[PDB]
Amino acid sequence: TQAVEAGEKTVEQFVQALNKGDYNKAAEMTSKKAANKSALSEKEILDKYQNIYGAADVKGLQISNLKVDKKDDSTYSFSYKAKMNTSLGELKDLSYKGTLDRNDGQTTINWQPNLVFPEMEGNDKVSLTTQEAARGNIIDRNGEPLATTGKLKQLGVVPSKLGDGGEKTANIKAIASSFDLTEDAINQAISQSWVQPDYFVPLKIIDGATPELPAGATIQEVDGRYYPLGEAAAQLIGYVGDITAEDIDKNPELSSNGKIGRSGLEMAFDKDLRGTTGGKLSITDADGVEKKVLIEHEVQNGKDIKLTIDAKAQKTAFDSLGGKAGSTVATTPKTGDLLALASSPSYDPNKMTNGISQEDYKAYEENPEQPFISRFATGYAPGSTFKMITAAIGLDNGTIDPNEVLTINGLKWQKDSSWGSAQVTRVSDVSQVDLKTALIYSDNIYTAQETLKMGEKKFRTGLDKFIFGEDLDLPISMNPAQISNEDSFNSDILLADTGYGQGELLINPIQQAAMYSVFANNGTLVYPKLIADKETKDKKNVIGETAVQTIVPDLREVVQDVNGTAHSLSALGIPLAAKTGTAEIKEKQDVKGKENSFLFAFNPDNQGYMMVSMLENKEDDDSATKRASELLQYLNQNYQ
Numbered sequence: 162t163q164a165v166e167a168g169e170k171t172v173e174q175f176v177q178a179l180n181k182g183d184y185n186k187a188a189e190m191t192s193k194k195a196a197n198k199s200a201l202s203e204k205e206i207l208d209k210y211q212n213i214y215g216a217a218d219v220k221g222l223q224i225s226n227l228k229v230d231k232k233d234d235s236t237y238s239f240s241y242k243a244k245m246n247t248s249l250g251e252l253k254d255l256s257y258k259g260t261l262d263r264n265d266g267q268t269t270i271n272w273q274p275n276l277v278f279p280e281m282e283g284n285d286k287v288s289l290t291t292q293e294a295a296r297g298n299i300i301d302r303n304g305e306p307l308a309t310t311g312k313l314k315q316l317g318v319v320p321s322k323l324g325d326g327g328e329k330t331a332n333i334k335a336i337a338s339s340f341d342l343t344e345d346a347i348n349q350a351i352s353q354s355w356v357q358p359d360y361f362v363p364l365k366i367i368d369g370a371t372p373e374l375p376a377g378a379t380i381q382e383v384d385g386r387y388y389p390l391g392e393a394a395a396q397l398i399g400y401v402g403d404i405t406a407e408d409i410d411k412n413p414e415l416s417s418n419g420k421i422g423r424s425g426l427e428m429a430f431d432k433d434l435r436g437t438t439g440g441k442l443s444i445t446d447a448d449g450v451e452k453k454v455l456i457e458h459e460v461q462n463g464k465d466i467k468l469t470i471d472a473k474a475q476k477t478a479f480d481s482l483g484g485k486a487g488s489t490v491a492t493t494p495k496t497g498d499l500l501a502l503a504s505s506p507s508y509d510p511n512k513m514t515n516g517i518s519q520e521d522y523k524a525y526e527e528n529p530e531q532p533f534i535s536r537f538a539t540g541y542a543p544g545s546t547f548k549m550i551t552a553a554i555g556l557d558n559g560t561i562d563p564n565e566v567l568t569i570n571g572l573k574w575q576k577d578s579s580w581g582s583a584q585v586t587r588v589s590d591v592s593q594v595d596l597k598t599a600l601i602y603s604d605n606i607y608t609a610q611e612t613l614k615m616g617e618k619k620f621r622t623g624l625d626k627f628i629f630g631e632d633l634d635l636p637i638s639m640n641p642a643q644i645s646n647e648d649s650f651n652s653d654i655l656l657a658d659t660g661y662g663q664g665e666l667l668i669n670p671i672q673q674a675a676m677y678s679v680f681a682n683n684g685t686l687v688y689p690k691l692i693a694d695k696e697t698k699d700k701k702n703v704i705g706e707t708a709v710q711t712i713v714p715d716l717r718e719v720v721q722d723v724n725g726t727a728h729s730l731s732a733l734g735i736p737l738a739a740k741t742g743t744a745e746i747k748e749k750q751d752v753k754g755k756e757n758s759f760l761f762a763f764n765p766d767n768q769g770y771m772m773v774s775m776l777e778n779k780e781d782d783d784s785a786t787k788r789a790s791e792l793l794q795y796l797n798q799n800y801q
Contacts, residue, residue, distance in 0.1 A: 164268070168229040168237045168261045171268045176243070180222040184210040191272035192262040199272040200283075206272055213277055213287045217442055218248040218413035229261070237261040237268070248291065248413045249442055249456040255279050278444060280453050286445045293416050294436030296386070297463030299398060299426060302498070302693055305472040306389055308398050308427060313515070314371055315383045316340055317363040320351045323377035335375040340365055346518075366515045386420060386514050390472065392507035393479035396535040397470070397637075399425020400510040414438065420514070425535075426466070429636040436463035467693040469498035477795055478503040478774075481788045486777040488536035490670040491792065493800055494681035494763060494771040496697045497689040500800070501792075502637075502671070504536040529750070530777075538639040540667035541775065544759040546742030547662025548608050549712055550676065551615075552596060553684075554623030556708035560615040563596045563711055567607055574606040576613060576653060583654045585609040585661075589724075600715045603726045603741060605661040612660025617650055620660070626703050627676050627686065634698070635671070635691055642668040642676075662742060674773045677761055679703045680713055680738070681768040713738050713765050720762075727760070727786050735797045738765035741786055746778075760785035762793060770796035 178187035188206040192198040227241040244253040260271040274281040299308035323329045337344040401420035422428035439460025444453045478489040482505035491501040555561030573584040589602040599607035645665040650656045658664035678687045686700040716738035719725040727739040742759035755778040763771035774785040
């Protein structure tokens with residue numbers, strides 16, 4: 162019992178050393194090389210485990226049902242079941258067995274080749290054959306491709322068929338002008354360490370018609386990932402990169418030869434898109450004659466994935482931002498179908514996955530506008546567009562009388578002198594302001610006064626009926642929206658600022674479209690969905706139906722009234738209910754007030770589409786409303 166307990170500890174420590182990959186530590190626990198002891202020496206056991214387990218990418222060796230008995234006065238027999246993860250899946254139900262040696266005062270393992278795999282004898286060999294799985298495609302709501310593996314035209318040069326002295330520099334200058342390349346990068350590519358005289362050094366991926374090939378230029382077709390929309394959907398779709406050795410150490414079921422999604426939907430759906438590797442892991446004998454097949458299954462290609470995105474709406478929404486910092490979200494508010502999730506500025510996912518220079522990558526990462534940000538999933542202050550929600554809450558709890566007219570003098574206002582220099586600011590000096598006037602002119606002072614009159618308790622009661630704190634069921638990384646930092650404002654100034662969409666509010670554009678959908682469903686919140694085959698989930702009785710039939714007519718006047726903030730949209734001649742907004746942010750960089758322009762708009766007749774667009778740190782005389790004419794036409798003519 163005292164020695165049998167020490168034998169169980171030896172088997173447990175040996176398996177642990179194998180699980181941790183330290184094969185040297187495991188080999189030092191074996192007995193000496195003999196006929197009925199260890200079969201191989203310590204350094205030979207190290208090399209056999211490192212070769213065999215390293216070939217199949219063995220990971221996570223764990224045992225169970227351990228039993229250590231006693232045979233002779235110095236031999237203790239052990240046995241256990243075990244399982245492990247390999248590059249072809251999990252290898253479960255393995256019956257291991259062996260003998261221990263209890264000479265001296267420390268128990269060792271009589272090592273045998275059956276301790277690598279159960280039925281191995283002497284000089285048995287292990288063979289692994291694998292076939293890569295094709296990565297699945299990502300498609301829009303109409304089957305158009307958003308991410309596809311296909312053939313590409315790769316531009317490269319062979320330094321031998323170029324020329325000697327002047328003929329080489331002339332062709333390099335000719336290839337640089339025929340394919341929009343710098344003459345200093347062609348020389349740097351052909352002068353890398355890995356280059357040999359007769360090698361094919363790739364350069365650029367041409368995504369169109371190939372021009373004339375100078376002396377030394379050659380195109381070779383290669384298979385790779387391709388994104389048709391390009392930068393218009395780079396943040397949403399993402400990109401794939403080469404699989405590294407570290408990736409295989411974390412997940413052996415990957416393909417060391419394949420691609421892995423690094424961000425976006427390519428990464429959120431990497432498992433469903435990459436498929437499963439097919440092949441066979443067998444034990445052979447001396448040569449290649451198979452004895453036992455351990456693992457084998459056919460290769461399964463990756464599943465395709467269909468999104469609610471519209472490929473034409475995604476491109477139009479992105480191009481409408483003109484490369485400026487901002488985001489645009491388009492949905493069908495009755496179902497939640499995310500038609501477009503645009504973010505600007507953006508990066509080139511094709512250049513990102515087909516080899517990008519450290520210079521162009523640093524330009525993306527050091528750009529102050531930060532194109533890598535998925536702005537549709539980034540928490541922003543909603544802006545004074547948030548008046549609709551505060552007004553709807555005010556109508557529900559009866560705080561706001563739609564016909565009561567407040568008297569506001571000037572462009573600034575504060576409750577008491579206790580507010581110091583904290584003041585609510587508006588843009589239009591309108592003396593007689595009611596709810597309809599406040600929504601047309603986007604009057605923050607009216608909203609601030611109604612919020613303070615409503616009180617924090619009644620205001621939070623209406624806010625809590627939304628999606629603050631909820632994690633949306635979406636394959637996009639994002640934090641839940643919040644009302645403030647803590648569960649109480651503890652500040653009249655913060656309460657008022659929260660009223661018209663400022664303060665510590667944090668709501669990303671997707672969450673905004675979810676909350677704003679109540680005006681297209683008679684007070685019912687419709688959760689947005691990105692996967693086409695998903696069921697429509699909704700949240701009923703968020704705001705009163707009376708508040709909807711009171712605010713939406715006013716939102717029509719935001720477009721139709723000549724002094725409405727979105728009156729430029731009346732040029733469309735389509736039924737529009739809209740609401741613009743602004744937000745002042747005290748960021749860093751300099752300290753000059755950064756302003757954000759917002760636009761909410763949907764069809765108040767058919768409720769077919771809804772739009773939430775915003776510009777981050779807007780240039781002067783720019784706005785989201787100025788850039789929405791094109792997308793609103795498409796959504797109106799195709800989503801009724």
